[PDB]
């Protein structure tokens, strides 16, 4: 499935099994534009987070209960949700995924 492939392909599960990860199916510039959208606070309290005005296409990758290195196993859940990212640097671009509503 998509998650098993993309997670290994992107060097996420080549040396370990990551329990969960999210992929955004939007253009790079459209996702970077989120850094100047709705400011909100991050889970950790810091307020350099921003929520997208609109929902975006995303795939949630989740490890099953039987997954175990070196044979990671994921469940694929596709959805459209608002993404929350933390930004920093100059240009002000995303550096962390904080959640999706």
């Amino acid at each position: 499935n998509y998650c098993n492939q993309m997670m290994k392909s992107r060097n996420l599960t080549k040396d370990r099994c990551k329990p969960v990860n999210t992929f955004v199916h939007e253009s790079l510039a459209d996702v970077q534009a989120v850094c100047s959208q709705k400011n909100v606070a991050c889970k950790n309290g810091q307020t350099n987070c921003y929520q997208s005005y609109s929902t975006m296409s995303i795939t949630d990758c989740r490890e099953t209960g039987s997954s175990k290195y070196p044979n990671c196993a994921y469940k694929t859940t596709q959805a459209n949700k608002h993404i929350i990212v933390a930004c920093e640097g100059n240009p002000y671009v995303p550096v962390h995924f904080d959640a999706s509503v």
């Binding site: 993309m6 992107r10 060097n11 996420l12 990860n21 999210t22 992929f23 955004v24 199916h25 939007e26 253009s27 790079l28 996702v31 795939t59 990212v85 640097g89 671009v93 995303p94 550096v95 962390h96 995924f97």
Partner: peptide, 15 residues
């Protein structure tokens, strides 16, 4: 080697 903006992209972006 890899900056944090690059890592976010490789880990979460699939355009």
């Amino acid at each position: 080697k890899e900056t944090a903006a690059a890592k976010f992209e490789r880990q979460h972006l699939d355009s």
